[PDB]
Design a protein around this ligand. Structure first.
Ligand SMILES: CC(C)=CCC/C(C)=C/CC/C(C)=C/CC/C(C)=C/CC/C(C)=C\CC/C(C)=C/CC/C(C)=C/CC/C(C)=C\CC/C(C)=C/CC1=C(C)C(=O)c2ccccc2C1=O
Ligand code: SF4
Ligand code: SF4
Ligand code: SF4
Lengths: 40, 407, 219, 166, 183, 191, 124
């Protein structure tokens, strides 16, 4: 299953774990951010 | 639900994570529930930076990728170049023997670093110092042979950057004599140590099916009992003529991987003995002057330089010699267009190199399938559900060198 | 077509990328062709592999799926057709006669001068039971860089497919989450593409500076 | 006997009676290998003429672009090397030099060598851009100032063949 | 701190001398290796050498305890924020040692991915060549940092030194203008 | 001796010293509890740890090594136990315990704190409790003239313990082995 | 009152270039501009700590301490910090300029009108 679930995204000014990663189209990947976190 | 699980960074700056690896752990108190992996904190652009340099120059880049296994990266690169050139069958025997000797001494060095860093991660502080005494024993040989301690550019397309210094063979014989004893001194600290075994036995378990699924290779795969080693299956650089045992284990866990590394050190010492046994004098560079690295380094009272004989040849006598030196040094060989994927058994697994040439003097593509990058897919498998202290042991057992991971 | 793929067309002698430093030498036209399809009797186990593949797939499915077969330096490349990649990979992994358990990764390679085939993903596969190995190659256009992800067949590819996207923009449709793995999520461009500038800076010297290697002359 | 698990103690105790192995740097620096890739050095012929001919081959080969060379003409009024060219400017950016040694293999006159001297560090980004005057090897005995005519009757070929003396 | 509010007489001078001595003799590094140079840093701590000799055995794992940062590696773009965070999370006084060509100026990897010198993100006390710098070179650079630390002003002397250094720095012509024999 | 061993282990634990330096565990928690502390506050934590080392080693000397009595080679020497020499002997014994501490640091990994607690509750506590019972019975018998009956008990009891502990070590647990099954991911053939 | 702009760079020519792009009175509909020039990170930090600056221009290529690092520091350390403009020595440095949180970033070589427009946007 998602080998090792995708990491939270890294942005300029935001690298915390709560930051969701960006899919190619520009949407936010739900899997990158843990289930327990309240989005961002 | 949420409220009982914390989310923490093992983070880049953490003693166990080699500074540039980010394990994002969702932990229920202190059990790892999920282990996300964050990579690229050591990305260096090597795969692209290569494209603006010639062959025999990209070597200096590739040895920097997996900096613990420099000779393996360089051998993979130069074997790819030779395969593209079709020169794999023309390389001198002595160059191949030196290549095996250096790759195996590098395997000893890389496993020593792996064991040292793991032991200090798991509190075994003296592991670092004993492993590094042993490693310094080998790094002195590396310094003598190549003039560098790491990131050597000694292995070059079609041969080596130069031949062994006269004292090198005796230094390596001394290594073959002492490495058993110093390695035994290290083993006394860990091998049967009750706290060490308790800290790694059963920890980081990964099934053979798991290894196949994630593409794991190296000690992690062989700890499942599978005797898969690219040195025996798909031989390269003349390993076919060396008698050595593929080290394997049945524990499928961190301690199995540790024992595999400790035994692979001995197998490397045995292969090094064989190398010294079958090391006959001869050229270290292909005799085809159209491709051979033209420089002949020799020491003098004024330091390491081109040998004065070579200077005389190319500046006083040999016009074709001068042209070849000039062009092979500046422009460098131009490789026929084509693709080739060549793999070696790096200490951490199947280090593959996809090499693409566009007929030019610079590589068109050099992609390293570094084993560490794929092995880090196993952080989830070997950490999730276990203790964070056990996750540290698992990650150490993977022995990820982040330079190769991020390249 | 059996004509080779030309990834570049060298103009003039000495590898000049532009007009050239000596007059009258620029009129040569040397296309840069990768090897074309090997005739048929592929060396070693390659035939044994491909024949088996051609058996497990139908004649129609095999012809529609495998665009080319190229043996070069005793290395077998199967230029597979896009869209059909998951089926071929499933056949390779599952078939006992092929049984390529170990996919070693995915590597992107960009050929801007190869019309309609700009981005090639290379899949090195190894069969441990049979001690064999081959390389699948899937070509996608730049305008439609979408390739089918092999995740269901080779989970190991997940990160590789990610890196390859990050570095080339090859959109592996069907991948769980194609997030950039190496570069920051907010990074613009795909560095390993040729169109992406090297992004170096001049090296400083007392009274001078050397521009990066991508700006200075080359051959 | 359960003693094997305690072997580590035997190790550490034993080592605290064998002498420490640390090199005594800097009071007693360790022996670096003769082949070590130390600081580049620009050398001279026995008569003192600079070996470098400013061909920029060393800088050509440098993967790091860590060498900057500008050539200039030798002339009777001012001659620095045998032959028509010499390296008037010769800088090495040691904050870009990776010590690879490709420069050395590139040099066709052995003007560039690598010493075993390695101590180098400065507080300025610019103090580590070492110029020609920092690199030229010390003017040994029997040598004369670099700006002078060739040894009498000798010619550049005589220099490259090693047929020169103070 | 009050130690810097002493009058500019002998009290402040002796306090500066003793504090510089102590800070140079107890210059704990942060456990912050990055790359090749991190391996050479571990080798420096290794028995063949002994960084502990210089009071630097404790590679501080927490940035709070660490007084020195051996960058010792190549700072990718994605690492510059993290490296800066670690730096800012050390407690003053703190010095930074750019170990290696990668850390000091980007080294061979003059590319998009590499920051081209941690100087971009953190003040650098000492630059150290090498790729990697051998452990003897690391010890040399650390001793040069010891010399820099001992001769360190405090209080009113610190302000005077900052003013003098600023005035001096405004005059140096830039490296690109130091055209010597370069035609 | 059993009480001495249990106390010394519980001691090395109490001071948070390796192989039980778990609260810090620099290899796992970076700096553990003293992360976020710098300057004299961290210095105070570490000074407290070292003073705890000194206190517990001094207690170990006091209640297992005759406290300040001179060792055997100086036991026969006149006045070895008088004046200031007892201070020297006490410091010597305390520093032998200090050496034991340093030696433990230099030759052992650190347990996982769950493993350490399992040690404490499955080895240390049972052993100490059974030793207390055995010693009580031994003293009662010696005070009741049974004599040999105590020696037969004492020697036997430890002999039994040394077995059952090894039972929890190798002869009954922590020395087993198992296998596992493959999944659907087309796994290779293990020779 | 006059606006004070802290221009930070150890390269004197970059400071002169910034002072040229911005005249004594940029956008004559705006107040006069006063220039305090600093060539060291400690001095730049101390001047910021003094405060009263309307804008600070930090050369991202400053040798001993880059203007991006100084930008992040000044935003983390001075309450009510004035807006920061950064000169970036590389186009790929934009990401770091984003991380530095500087209100704007002007690539080298300093384009006079671009820098003036950026400053006017920040000081308005
Ligand atoms: C005429 C005459 C005879 C006069 C005598 C007057 C005199 C000298 C007085 C003596 C009595 C005193 C000292 C009174 C003055 C008042 C006083 C006590 C002030 C205290 C002030 C204070 C709290 C701090 C200032 C410093 C100080 C002197 C404090 C007490 C002594 C000590 C040693 C305290 C803290 C230092 C300490 C114990 C730990 C530092 C932290 C660490 C990690 C230590 C070093 C260290 C450790 C411990 C590792 O574990 C380690 C492991 C592996 C590799 C490396 C290391 C490593 O580096
Ligand atoms: S050092 Fe050697 S290669 Fe470099 S310019 Fe001088 S002669 Fe040419
Ligand atoms: S050692 Fe290598 S990087 Fe340094 S100047 Fe010589 S060729 Fe260039
Ligand atoms: S400077 Fe050289 S040795 Fe140091 S990290 Fe960079 S590539 Fe590795």
């Amino acid at each position: 299953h998602p080998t090792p679930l995708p990491n939270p995204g890294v942005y300029a000014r935001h690298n915390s774990v709560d930051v969701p990663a960006r899919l190619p189209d520009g949407s936010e990947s739900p899997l990158s951010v843990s289930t327990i976190l309240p989005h961002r | 639900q949420a409220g009982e699980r914390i989310v923490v960074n093992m983070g880049p700056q953490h003693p166990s994570t080699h500074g540039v690896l980010r394990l994002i752990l969702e932990i229920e108190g202190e059990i790892i529930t999920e282990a996300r992996c964050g990579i690229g904190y050591l990305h260096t652009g090597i795969e692209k930076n290569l494209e603006y340099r010639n062959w025999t120059q990209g070597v200096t880049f590739v040895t920097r990728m997996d900096y613990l296994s420099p000779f393996f990266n360089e051998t993979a690169y130069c074997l790819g170049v030779e395969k593209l050139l079709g020169i794999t069958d023309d390389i001198p025997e002595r160059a191949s023997v030196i290549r095996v000797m250096l790759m195996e001494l590098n395997r000893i060095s890389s496993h020593l670093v792996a064991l040292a860093t793991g032991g200090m991660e798991l509190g075994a502080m003296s592991a670092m110092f004993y492993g590094f005494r042993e490693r310094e024993e080998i790094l002195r040989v590396f310094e003598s042979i190549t003039g560098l301690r790491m990131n050597h550019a000694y292995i070059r397309p079609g041969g080596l950057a130069a031949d062994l210094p006269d004292d090198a063979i005796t230094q390596v014989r001394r290594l073959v004599e002492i490495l058993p004893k110093r390695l035994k001194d290290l083993e006394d600290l860990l091998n049967e140590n009750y706290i060490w075994k308790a800290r790694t036995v059963g920890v980081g378990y990964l099934d053979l099916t798991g290894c196949m699924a994630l593409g794991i290779t190296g000690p992690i795969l062989r700890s499942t009992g599978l005797p898969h080693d690219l040195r025996k299956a798909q031989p390269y650089c003349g390993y076919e003529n060396y008698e050595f045992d593929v080290i394997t284990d049945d524990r499928c866990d961190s301690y199995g991987r540790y024992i595999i590394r400790v035994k692979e050190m001995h197998e490397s010492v045995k292969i090094v003995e064989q190398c010294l046994a079958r090391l006959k004098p001869g050229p270290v560079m292909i005799s085809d002057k159209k491709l051979a690295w033209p420089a002949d380094l020799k020491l003098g009272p004024d330091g390491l330089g081109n040998s004065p004989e070579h200077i005389a040849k190319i500046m006083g006598r040999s016009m074709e010699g001068l042209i070849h030196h000039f062009k092979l040094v500046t422009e460098g060989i131009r490789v026929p267009p084509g693709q080739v994927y060549v793999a070696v058994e790096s200490p951490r697994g199947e280090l593959g190199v996809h090499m693409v040439s566009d007929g030019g003097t610079r590589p068109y593509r050099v992609h390293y399938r570094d084993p560490s990058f794929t092995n880090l897919q196993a952080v989830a498998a070997t950490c999730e559900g276990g203790m964070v202290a056990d996750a540290i042991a698992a990650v150490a057992s993977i022995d990820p060198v982040m330079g190769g991971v991020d390249r | 077509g059996d004509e080779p793929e030309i990834i570049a067309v060298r103009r003039g002698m000495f590898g000049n990328r532009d007009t050239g430093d000596t007059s009258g030498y620029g009129r040569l036209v040397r296309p840069v062709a990768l090897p074309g399809s090997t005739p048929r009797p592929y060396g070693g186990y390659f035939d044994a592999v491909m024949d088996r593949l051609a058996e497990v797939l139908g004649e129609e499915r095999y012809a529609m799926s495998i665009e080319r077969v190229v043996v070069y330096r005793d290395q077998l490349t199967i230029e597979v057709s896009r869209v059909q990649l998951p089926a071929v990979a499933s056949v390779l992994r599952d078939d006992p006669d092929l049984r390529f358990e170990l996919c070693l990764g995915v590597s992107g390679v960009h050929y801007p001068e190869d019309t309609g085939r700009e981005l090639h993903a290379v899949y090195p596969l190894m069969s441990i039971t049979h001690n064999r190995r081959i390389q699948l190659e899937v070509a996608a256009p730049d305008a439609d860089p979408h390739i089918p992800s092999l995740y269901a067949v080779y989970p190991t590819t997940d990160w590789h497919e990610r890196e390859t996207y990050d570095f080339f923009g090859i959109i592996f449709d069907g991948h769980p989450s194609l997030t950039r793995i190496e570069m920051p999520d907010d990074w613009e461009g795909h560095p390993q593409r040729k169109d992406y500038p090297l992004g170096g800076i001049p090296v400083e010297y007392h009274g001078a500076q050397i521009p990066p290697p991508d700006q200075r002359r080359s051959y | 006997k359960f003693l094997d698990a305690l072997a580590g103690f035997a190790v550490t105790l034993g080592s605290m009676f064998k002498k420490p192995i640390t090199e005594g740097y800097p009071e007693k620096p360790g022996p670096v290998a003769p082949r070590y890739h130390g600081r580049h050095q620009l050398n001279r012929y026995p008569d003192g003429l600079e070996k470098c001919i400013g061909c920029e081959l060393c800088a050509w080969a440098c993967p790091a672009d860590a060498i900057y060379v500008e050539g200039a003409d030798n002339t009777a009024d001012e001659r620095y090397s045998p032959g028509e060219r010499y390296g008037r400017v010769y800088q090495i950016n040691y904050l870009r030099c990776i010590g690879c040694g490709l420069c050395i293999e590139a040099c066709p006159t052995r003007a560039l060598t690598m010493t075993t001297e390695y101590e180098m560090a400065d507080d300025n980004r610019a103090d580590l851009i070492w110029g020609k005057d920092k690199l030229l090897a010390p003017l040994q005995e029997g040598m004369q100032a670099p700006p002078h005519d060739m040894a009498p009757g000798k010619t550049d070929d005589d220099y490259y063949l090693g047929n020169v003396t103070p | 701190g009050l130690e810097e509010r002493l009058p500019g007489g002998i009290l402040l001078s002796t306090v500066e001398t003793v504090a510089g001595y102590v800070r140079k003799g107890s210059l704990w590094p942060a456990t912050f290796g990055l790359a090749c140079c991190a391996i050479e840093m571990m080798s420096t701590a290794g028995p063949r050498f002994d960084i502990a000799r210089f009071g630097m055995e404790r590679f501080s794992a927490t940035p709070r305890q660490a007084d020195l940062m051996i960058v010792a590696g190549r700072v990718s773009q994605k690492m510059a924020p993290v490296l800066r965070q670690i730096y800012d999370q050390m407690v003053e006084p703190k010095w930074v040692l750019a170990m290696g060509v990668c850390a000091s100026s980007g080294g061979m990897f003059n590319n998009y991915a590499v920051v081209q010198g941690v100087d971009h993100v953190v003040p650098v006390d000492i630059y150290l060549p090498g790729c990697p710098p051998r452990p003897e070179m690391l010890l040399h650079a650390i001793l040069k940092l010891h010399d820099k630390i001992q001769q360190m002003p405090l209080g009113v002397n610190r302000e005077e030194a900052i003013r003098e250094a600023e005035q001096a720095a405004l005059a140096v012509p830039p490296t690109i203008e130091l055209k010597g024999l370069l035609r | 001796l059993p009480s001495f061993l249990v106390y010394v282990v519980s001691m090395v634990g109490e001071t948070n010293r390796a192989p039980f330096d778990l609260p810090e565990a620099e290899g796992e928690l970076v700096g553990g509890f003293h992360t976020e502390y710098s300057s004299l506050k961290f210095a105070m934590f570490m000074l407290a740890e070292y003073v705890n080392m000194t206190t517990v080693s001094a207690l170990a000397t006091t209640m297992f090594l005759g406290g300040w009595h001179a060792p055997f080679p100086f036991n026969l020497i006149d006045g070895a136990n008088s004046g200031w020499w007892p201070l020297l002997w006490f410091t010597a014994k305390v520093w032998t315990f200090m050496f034991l501490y340093f030696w433990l640091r230099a030759t052992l990994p650190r347990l996982r704190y769950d493993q350490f607690m399992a040690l404490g509750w499955k080895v240390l506590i049972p052993v100490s409790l059974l030793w207390i019972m055995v010693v009580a019975i031994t003293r009662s018998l010696r005070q009741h003239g049974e004599g040999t009956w105590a020696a037969w008990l004492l020697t036997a009891a430890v002999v039994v313990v040394v077995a059952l502990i090894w039972g929890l070590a190798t002869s009954l647990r922590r020395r087993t082995v198992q296998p596992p099954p493959p999944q659907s991911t087309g796994a290779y053939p293990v020779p | 009152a006059p606006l004070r702009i802290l221009v930070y760079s150890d390269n004197p020519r970059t400071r002169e270039q910034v002072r040229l792009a911005l005249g004594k009175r940029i956008h004559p509909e705006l107040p006069e501009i006063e220039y305090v020039d600093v060539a060291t990170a400690p001095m730049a930090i101390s001047q910021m700590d003094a405060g009263g600056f309307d804008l600070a221009i930090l050369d991202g290529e400053a040798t001993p301490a880059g203007g991006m690092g100084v930008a992040k520091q000044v935003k983390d350390e001075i309450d009510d910090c004035p807006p920061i403009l950064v000169l970036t020595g590389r186009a790929d440095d934009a990401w770091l300029a984003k991380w530095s949180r500087a209100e704007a970033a002007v690539p080298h070589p300093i384009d006079p009108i671009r820098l003036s427009d950026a400053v006017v946007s920040l000081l308005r």
